[PDB]
Design a protein around this motif. Structure first.
Motif, PDB file in Angstrom:
ATOM      1  N   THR A  64       6.936  -9.252 -12.787  1.00 13.82           N
ATOM      2  CA  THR A  64       7.078  -7.841 -12.455  1.00 13.82           C
ATOM      3  C   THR A  64       8.281  -7.603 -11.557  1.00 13.82           C
ATOM      4  N   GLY A  65       8.545  -8.517 -10.627  1.00 14.36           N
ATOM      5  CA  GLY A  65       9.742  -8.397  -9.820  1.00 14.36           C
ATOM      6  C   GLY A  65      11.000  -8.504 -10.653  1.00 14.36           C
ATOM      7  N   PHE A  66      10.964  -9.343 -11.685  1.00 11.02           N
ATOM      8  CA  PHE A  66      12.078  -9.437 -12.615  1.00 11.02           C
ATOM      9  C   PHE A  66      12.269  -8.116 -13.347  1.00 11.02           C
ATOM     10  N   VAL A  67      11.169  -7.447 -13.695  1.00 10.59           N
ATOM     11  CA  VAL A  67      11.266  -6.145 -14.339  1.00 10.59           C
ATOM     12  C   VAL A  67      11.588  -5.063 -13.321  1.00 10.59           C
ATOM     13  N   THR A  68      11.073  -5.191 -12.098  1.00  7.90           N
ATOM     14  CA  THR A  68      11.304  -4.167 -11.089  1.00  7.90           C
ATOM     15  C   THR A  68      12.775  -4.081 -10.707  1.00  7.90           C
TER      16      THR A  68
ATOM     17  N   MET B 123      -4.899  13.654   2.674  1.00  2.00           N
ATOM     18  CA  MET B 123      -5.720  12.482   2.407  1.00  2.00           C
ATOM     19  C   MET B 123      -4.939  11.416   1.655  1.00  2.00           C
ATOM     20  N   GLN B 124      -4.124  11.827   0.688  1.00  8.08           N
ATOM     21  CA  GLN B 124      -3.401  10.874  -0.142  1.00  8.08           C
ATOM     22  C   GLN B 124      -2.207  10.289   0.600  1.00  8.08           C
ATOM     23  N   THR B 125      -1.510  11.109   1.383  1.00  9.51           N
ATOM     24  CA  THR B 125      -0.356  10.616   2.125  1.00  9.51           C
ATOM     25  C   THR B 125      -0.774   9.586   3.166  1.00  9.51           C
ATOM     26  N   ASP B 126      -1.928   9.789   3.802  1.00  8.20           N
ATOM     27  CA  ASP B 126      -2.441   8.800   4.739  1.00  8.20           C
ATOM     28  C   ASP B 126      -2.892   7.535   4.025  1.00  8.20           C
ATOM     29  N   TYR B 127      -3.359   7.661   2.785  1.00  7.90           N
ATOM     30  CA  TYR B 127      -3.841   6.517   2.029  1.00  7.90           C
ATOM     31  C   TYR B 127      -2.703   5.686   1.456  1.00  7.90           C
ATOM     32  N   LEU B 128      -1.521   6.275   1.303  1.00 10.32           N
ATOM     33  CA  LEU B 128      -0.416   5.622   0.619  1.00 10.32           C
ATOM     34  C   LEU B 128       0.468   4.818   1.558  1.00 10.32           C
ATOM     35  N   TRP B 129       0.682   5.314   2.770  1.00  9.77           N
ATOM     36  CA  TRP B 129       1.642   4.736   3.690  1.00  9.77           C
ATOM     37  C   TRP B 129       1.027   4.635   5.077  1.00  9.77           C
TER      38      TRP B 129
ATOM     39  N   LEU C 267       5.153  -6.722   4.236  1.00 10.42           N
ATOM     40  CA  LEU C 267       5.605  -7.626   3.191  1.00 10.42           C
ATOM     41  C   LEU C 267       4.436  -8.291   2.486  1.00 10.42           C
ATOM     42  N   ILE C 268       3.361  -8.579   3.214  1.00 10.08           N
ATOM     43  CA  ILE C 268       2.187  -9.163   2.589  1.00 10.08           C
ATOM     44  C   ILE C 268       1.367  -8.100   1.878  1.00 10.08           C
ATOM     45  N   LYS C 269       1.352  -6.877   2.401  1.00 11.89           N
ATOM     46  CA  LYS C 269       0.567  -5.821   1.778  1.00 11.89           C
ATOM     47  C   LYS C 269       1.124  -5.480   0.404  1.00 11.89           C
ATOM     48  N   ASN C 270       2.433  -5.260   0.324  1.00 12.93           N
ATOM     49  CA  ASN C 270       3.104  -4.909  -0.926  1.00 12.93           C
ATOM     50  C   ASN C 270       4.447  -5.621  -0.964  1.00 12.93           C
ATOM     51  N   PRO C 271       4.466  -6.885  -1.382  1.00 16.97           N
ATOM     52  CA  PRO C 271       5.722  -7.649  -1.331  1.00 16.97           C
ATOM     53  C   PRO C 271       6.827  -7.096  -2.209  1.00 16.97           C
ATOM     54  N   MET C 272       6.502  -6.609  -3.401  1.00 15.81           N
ATOM     55  CA  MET C 272       7.532  -6.096  -4.291  1.00 15.81           C
ATOM     56  C   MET C 272       8.011  -4.717  -3.857  1.00 15.81           C
ATOM     57  N   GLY C 273       7.124  -3.892  -3.301  1.00 19.73           N
ATOM     58  CA  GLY C 273       7.549  -2.605  -2.783  1.00 19.73           C
ATOM     59  C   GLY C 273       8.417  -2.735  -1.549  1.00 19.73           C
ATOM     60  N   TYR C 274       8.161  -3.750  -0.726  1.00 18.77           N
ATOM     61  CA  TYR C 274       8.985  -3.978   0.454  1.00 18.77           C
ATOM     62  C   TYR C 274      10.355  -4.493   0.043  1.00 18.77           C
ATOM     63  N   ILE C 275      10.389  -5.420  -0.913  1.00 18.03           N
ATOM     64  CA  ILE C 275      11.650  -5.976  -1.383  1.00 18.03           C
ATOM     65  C   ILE C 275      12.467  -4.917  -2.115  1.00 18.03           C
ATOM     66  N   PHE C 276      11.806  -4.062  -2.897  1.00 12.90           N
ATOM     67  CA  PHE C 276      12.523  -3.050  -3.666  1.00 12.90           C
ATOM     68  C   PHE C 276      13.282  -2.095  -2.757  1.00 12.90           C
TER      69      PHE C 276
END
Ligand SMILES: CCCCCCCCCCCCCCCCCC(=O)OC[C@H](COP(=O)([O-])OCC(O)COP(=O)([O-])OC[C@@H](COC(=O)CCCCCCCCCCCCCCCCC)OC(=O)CCCCCCCCCCCCCCCCC)OC(=O)CCCCCCCCCCCCCCCCC
Ligand SMILES: CCCCCCCCCCCCCCCCCC(=O)OC[C@H](COP(=O)([O-])OCC(O)COP(=O)([O-])OC[C@@H](COC(=O)CCCCCCCCCCCCCCCCC)OC(=O)CCCCCCCCCCCCCCCCC)OC(=O)CCCCCCCCCCCCCCCCC
Ligand SMILES: CCCCCCCCCCCCCCCCCC(=O)OC[C@H](COP(=O)([O-])OCC(O)COP(=O)([O-])OC[C@@H](COC(=O)CCCCCCCCCCCCCCCCC)OC(=O)CCCCCCCCCCCCCCCCC)OC(=O)CCCCCCCCCCCCCCCCC
Ligand SMILES: CCCCCCCCCCCCCCCCCC(=O)OC[C@H](COP(=O)([O-])OCC(O)COP(=O)([O-])OC[C@@H](COC(=O)CCCCCCCCCCCCCCCCC)OC(=O)CCCCCCCCCCCCCCCCC)OC(=O)CCCCCCCCCCCCCCCCC
Ligand SMILES: CCCCCCCCCCCCCCCCCC(=O)OC[C@H](COP(=O)([O-])OCC(O)COP(=O)([O-])OC[C@@H](COC(=O)CCCCCCCCCCCCCCCCC)OC(=O)CCCCCCCCCCCCCCCCC)OC(=O)CCCCCCCCCCCCCCCCC
Ligand SMILES: CCCCCCCC/C=C/CCCCCCCC(=O)OC[C@H](COP(=O)(O)OCCN)OC(=O)CCCCCCC/C=C/CCCCCCCC
Lengths: 62, 99, 50, 200, 50
Positions: C39-43, D6-12, D84-93
């Motif tokens: 997924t990271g490769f796709v992301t 409710m959703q904004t608090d749940y997302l971030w 980074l542990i919670k959402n590793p790909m979102g943090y890296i992106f």
């Protein structure tokens, strides 16, 4: 207590002891490793329920 | 001493090909009959053994099992008890162990 | 040993008997990790949403 | 909207510290300073202006007063680790968005992936060779040094060069191809004959 | 070796049965305790040398 370890052997004869504890009929069809699968696999199942804790603070769940 | 050192007692021939090292042939290697020809040959032996080589077999099987014992005194005890009192030298001639 | 055996050698007999447990959920964990890597490769390379 | 809060608090996640609630502890910017930006000297002037307005341009009051660290930066390394542990790909992106605005060619991206995966492949083989040395050690051969780059009078094998020339001539040994001989299945003939003898 | 990524030191307790007699939940109880004493060692050092 050393005599308590041999309690089930006194009521039996030698032929009954061998046929009971030594000559267990071969049955290699059981899933023996299910004991380890249920225990170690329970970590993953526990995480599914634990990841839904209603703890308000994010760092409390950390 | 080189770790990949081997002493071979039969002649081998090494291929002189770039990037590869292997035994490409054996000198004077004779190819025998195929797997099918050996199969047809073995079936002719097994068929004769099935048709005409099953009478009086139980006695010979008992003599063969007695001679797989460790000591000679146990072989004689096996022949006397199981094979109907057979003689050691006489049973060895039947089995083909005598010179 | 005298007839069909070799030289009597002294070794250390290990009482601990290791054995890799053949499990089912370990492959689920492995697929999830590779699913994150793919997924990271796709992301990074195949995400055209911006 | 209805479900926004409710959703904004749940997302971030938000900041829970009240570090800046205390007035005098607020930083003027002299704790974490940018050193190489082209407007560097304008940053220092704003810090100096902040220090002068706090003392009415009598900086002797600042010299006698207590100086505080930037409490807002406390535990910042831990907080990034947890994201980074919670959402590793979102943090890296999001941390690489500005860097990924400049995309190198297909060749450069392929060289990055190729050399990276090729290095991991050699590491995996190096780990497998260490298990070979451990089996050699347990088999009764003591090992001085380590590795397979033999200093002495031995042949070495460096590992497949990751170029198509050698990758066409050679391929690694697949362990799953080493099998039990199928003649083992001929022992089942004993079972079929026994079942007929016993009248099964 | 439990802190190394892809270790090759197979003879350094990697292939041995290593149990202890300390408190369990190691990274929650024992490991933070070693770090707490570390902070005391350096804070006590800073106070003394200064
Ligand atoms: C009708 C309304 C209600 C009325 C009734 C109210 C009363 C209810 C109670 C009585 C009825 C209970 C029914 C079951 C009988 C069990 C009785 C018992 O004593 O069990 C004790 C039970 C087991 O005791 P144990 O031997 O100590 O095992 C735990 C060890 O940690 C184990 O550690 P380990 O190292 O020895 O082993 C590792 C372990 C892995 O274990 C772990 O890693 C977890 C460790 C916990 C986290 C680690 C941090 C430790 C935190 C310490 C502080 C916690 C204190 C909490 C104290 C709470 C006290 C109760 O892996 C395994 O051993 C195997 C796990 C996989 C096996 C399969 C499990 C199947 C469970 C049931 C599945 C079906 C349920 C539906 C799914 C859930 C709903 C979606 O203890 C528990 O309380 C477990 C809690 C787990 C979370 C439960 C959440 C779900 C609760 C279900 C409620 C009903 C469904 C929801 C209905 C919703 C509408 C109401
Ligand atoms: C007589 C019987 C009893 C005897 C008792 C003897 C012991 C005495 C007990 C008390 C000792 C301390 C005395 C009181 C100190 C109070 C000082 C204070 O006011 O707070 C300052 C300090 C201020 O922190 P802060 O201002 O909020 O934020 C920090 C900065 O903002 C920076 O935040 P940051 O986000 O930028 O992160 C950077 C941070 C930390 O960032 C890091 O990089 C550290 C990473 C550590 C975790 C990773 C470790 C690596 C191994 C595990 C790998 C983790 C993997 C996780 C990820 C998974 C894989 C991806 O840098 C630091 O190191 C901060 C540490 C505190 C500064 C001290 C000077 C540090 C230099 C020394 C460094 C070496 C030690 C580091 C230890 C770090 C522990 C937190 O707070 C504390 O230190 C709290 C400690 C008090 C805890 C009390 C617990 C109960 C006490 C009893 C425990 C019983 C233990 C029994 C032991 C038995 C013997 C073995
Ligand atoms: C590293 C320094 C020494 C270390 C000391 C530490 C220094 C402190 C700084 C360290 C912190 C930063 C580290 C560097 C980061 C790069 C710097 C940066 O951010 O700049 C922004 C930079 C933007 O570049 P730009 O200059 O602004 O504009 C470029 C234009 O597009 C077009 O520009 P162009 O037309 O002029 O030329 C095209 C190409 C320029 O051409 C090249 O860059 C040639 C690259 C060819 C492949 C090189 C492979 C590197 C070897 C890795 C293999 C394993 C290493 C071990 C084996 C080999 C031993 C040597 O553009 C670039 O790629 C710019 C990057 C050039 C400098 C960075 C090159 C680093 C290579 C490593 C050097 C040797 C390290 C040895 C390892 C040491 C380990 C002990 O960000 C980038 O996007 C480039 C980074 C590479 C991205 C390529 C695409 C990767 C996509 C991967 C997708 C798959 C991932 C799946 C997800 C994973 C699972 C979730
Ligand atoms: C009717 C007309 C023909 C049909 C038209 C229909 C074509 C449809 C086109 C649709 C495009 C595909 C859409 C999906 C692709 C999107 C993803 C993508 O890869 O874009 C890259 C995207 C665009 O790259 P770019 O920087 O804009 O450069 C674009 C062009 O290169 C242009 O930039 P440049 O001008 O600077 O390039 C100069 C060029 C200059 O090249 C030359 O001047 C001459 C080239 C001669 C090649 C010599 C061949 C030697 C062969 C020796 C073989 C020996 C070993 C053989 C061993 C085999 C067994 C014995 O040299 C290159 O750098 C070429 C780039 C590499 C080309 C690789 C394929 C070459 C053959 C193409 C086959 C198609 C033939 C069509 C017939 C055309 C006849 C006129 O950049 C990225 O990398 C981001 C995506 C991340 C990709 C990394 C991983 C790639 C793998 C997954 C890719 C997707 C799955 C596979 C799809 C096919 C990929 C190979
Ligand atoms: C009609 C009635 C219907 C219901 C009927 C039944 C009612 C319930 C009865 C329950 C029956 C017993 C339950 C048995 C099931 C146990 C299953 C299980 O998973 O146990 C695993 C767990 C671990 O044991 P293990 O894994 O089997 O290992 C075996 C040995 O321990 C290994 O030995 P070791 O020495 O090697 O181990 C070292 C030792 C380490 O040393 C320790 O033992 C640690 C002790 C230090 C903590 C002590 C203070 C705790 C209380 C602080 C709060 C006080 C508030 C009030 C203050 C008043 C001040 C005067 O153990 C640990 O390592 C512990 C680490 C695991 C837990 C750490 C993290 C826990 C989570 C903490 C955050 C929780 C957030 C709350 C969220 C709520 C939802 C989850 O067992 C326990 O911890 C037993 C806990 C028993 C409950 C403790 C009381 C909790 C009170 C909480 C107060 C706040 C909430 C108040 C709610 C009020 C509601 C009315
Ligand atoms: C709606 C039904 C969906 C079912 C899934 C669809 C896929 C169907 C494809 C199945 C093909 C069947 C091929 C054969 C599979 C073999 C299964 C197997 O090996 O089980 C072995 C073994 C039997 O034990 P032994 O007595 O020792 O062995 C006897 C051997 N004769 O089974 C087990 O170990 C038990 C574990 C079974 C799987 C896990 C079950 C739990 C799954 C969780 C979901 C259940 C939710 C509700 C549970 C209630 C809990 C309170």
């Amino acid at each position: 207590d050393f005599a308590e370890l041999l309690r089930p052997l006194r009521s039996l004869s030698f032929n009954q002891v061998v046929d009971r504890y030594v000559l267990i009929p071969p049955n290699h069809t059981f899933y023996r490793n299910w004991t380890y699968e249920k225990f170690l696999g329970g970590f993953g199942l526990s995480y599914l329920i634990l990841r839904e804790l209603p703890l308000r603070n994010f760092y409390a769940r950390v | 001493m080189q770790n990949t050192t081997n002493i071979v007692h039969v002649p081998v021939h090494m291929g002189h090909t770039h990037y590869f090292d292997y035994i490409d042939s054996f000198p004077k290697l004779k190819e025998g009959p195929t797997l099918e020809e050996n199969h047809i040959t073995n079936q002719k032996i097994l068929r004769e053994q099935l048709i005409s080589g099953q009478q009086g077999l139980e006695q010979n099987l008992c003599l063969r099992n007695c001679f797989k014992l460790s000591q000679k005194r146990y072989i004689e005890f096996c022949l006397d008890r199981k094979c109907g009192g057979a003689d050691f030298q006489r049973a060895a001639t039947i089995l083909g162990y005598t010179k | 040993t005298y007839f069909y055996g070799g030289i009597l050698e002294f070794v250390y007999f290990d009482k601990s008997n290791p054995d890799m447990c053949i499990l089912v959920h370990t492959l689920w964990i492995h697929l999830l990790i590779l699913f994150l890597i793919f997924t990271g490769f796709v992301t990074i390379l195949f995400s055209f949403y911006g | 909207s209805l479900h926004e809060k409710m959703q904004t608090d749940y997302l971030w996640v938000k900041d829970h510290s009240q570090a800046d609630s205390w007035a005098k502890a607020r930083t003027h910017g002299y704790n974490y300073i940018a050193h190489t930006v082209p407007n560097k000297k304008e940053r220092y002037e704003m810090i100096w202006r902040s220090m002068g307005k706090s003392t009415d341009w009598e900086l002797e009051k600042f010299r006698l007063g207590k100086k505080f660290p930037d409490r807002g930066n406390k535990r910042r390394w831990f907080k990034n680790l947890f994201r980074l542990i919670k959402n590793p790909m979102g943090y890296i992106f999001w941390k690489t968005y500005k860097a990924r605005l400049a995309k190198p060619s297909l060749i450069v991206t392929s060289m990055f992936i190729g050399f990276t995966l090729g290095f991991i492949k050699l590491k995996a083989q190096s780990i497998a060779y260490s298990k070979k040395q451990y089996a050699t050690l347990r088999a009764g051969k003591n090992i001085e040094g380590s590795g397979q780059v033999h200093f002495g009078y031995h042949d070495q094998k460096w590992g497949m060069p990751a170029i198509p020339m050698f990758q066409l001539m050679y391929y690694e040994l697949p362990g799953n191809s080493i099998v039990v001989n199928p003649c083992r299945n001929q022992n089942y003939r004993l079972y079929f004959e026994m079942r007929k003898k016993l009248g099964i | 070796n439990s802190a190394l990524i892809g270790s090759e030191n197979q003879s350094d307790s990697m292939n041995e049965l290593n149990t202890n007699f300390s408190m369990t939940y190691y990274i929650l109880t024992v490991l933070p305790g070693k770090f707490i004493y570390w902070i005391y060692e350096i804070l006590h050092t800073f106070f003394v040398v200064c």
